[PDB]
Amino acid sequence: TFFHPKSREDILNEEAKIVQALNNQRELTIKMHELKREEKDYAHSYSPLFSDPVPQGGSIGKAPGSSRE
Amino acid sequence: PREAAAHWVPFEDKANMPDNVPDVVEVGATSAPLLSASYFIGAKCKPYNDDFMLCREESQGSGAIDCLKEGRRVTRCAVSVIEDINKSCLDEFRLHWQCLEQNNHQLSGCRKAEALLNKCVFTKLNLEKKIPGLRPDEEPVFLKKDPWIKPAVDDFKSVRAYAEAKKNGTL
């Protein structure tokens, strides 16, 4: 009579909830390992404001014919 | 670019231009008359010079081979300017550039002859000197009445001519 255990069903549901959360952490971990080591944008990596990488040089003797694409 | 360093032998090239590139006369005027005529040239060859530098910019590396027509028109505009000067305003031009050569090509030492030249070419060729980028407030330095900087020796022929021309009212 003093034996008052939790039922089989509630036990199985609790273990299932635990395993579900562990699988959620697994997917989050993989997804972040993938989000890192993914190529970013230049603005996120170097310069948000001057996002044009292209280097403009000096101006004291700017020769027409020195720009190129 | 840079200058030669540590050793350098001049070397020419006795070849001729390709037959697909026509022929153009050269300006053949030296540093001093050319510097005198700079302003009159720029007042007349402005669109042509601008088109030249624009086609050099658009070409993006091939400017030496794509801009030949434009440089040719520039050279011809220049020759027309200097021919108009020598035909019409010769002695005044000679006064200016000799006054320059007896200085360090500082234009400050030649203002009298420069005045006679601007007057004559404005009356005949209708070309005036103008320094751009200035406000209406700023006073251009070639029209200042009593400038701070004056030559070591005002040129003789220039001074005699300036005085005789004020006496004659030409200025």
UniProtKB/TrEMBL annotation, chain A:
Q: Which domain of life is it from?
A: Eukaryota
Where do the segments described as Disordered lie? 46-69
Mind telling me what this protein is named?
Answer: Uncharacterized protein
Q: What organism is recorded for this protein?
A: Yarrowia lipolytica (Candida lipolytica)
Shown residues in whole-protein numbering: 71 to 139 of 139
From TrEMBL, chain B:
Alphabetical GO CC annotations of the entry are: mitochondrial inner membrane
Which keywords are on file for this protein? Disulfide bond, Electron transport, Membrane, Mitochondrion, Mitochondrion inner membrane, Repeat, Respiratory chain, Transport
Q: Which cysteines are joined by disulfide bonds?
A: C45-C77
Where along the sequence do coiled-coil regions lie?
none
The entry's localization annotation reads:
Mitochondrion inner membrane
- Annotated CHCH domain ranges read 89-122
Query: PROSITE patterns of this UniProt entry?
Result: CHCH
Name the major location: mitochondrion
- Biological processes annotated in GO: mitochondrial electron transport, NADH to ubiquinone
For this chain, the family text in UniProt reads: Belongs to the complex I NDUFA8 subunit family.
| Cited function | Accessory subunit of the mitochondrial membrane respiratory chain NADH dehydrogenase (Complex I), that is believed not to be involved in catalysis. Complex I functions in the transfer of electrons from NADH to the respiratory chain. The immediate electron acceptor for the enzyme is believed to be ubiquinone.
Q: What's the protein here called?
A: NADH-ubiquinone oxidoreductase
**Origin organism lineage:** Eukaryota, Fungi, Dikarya, Ascomycota, Saccharomycotina
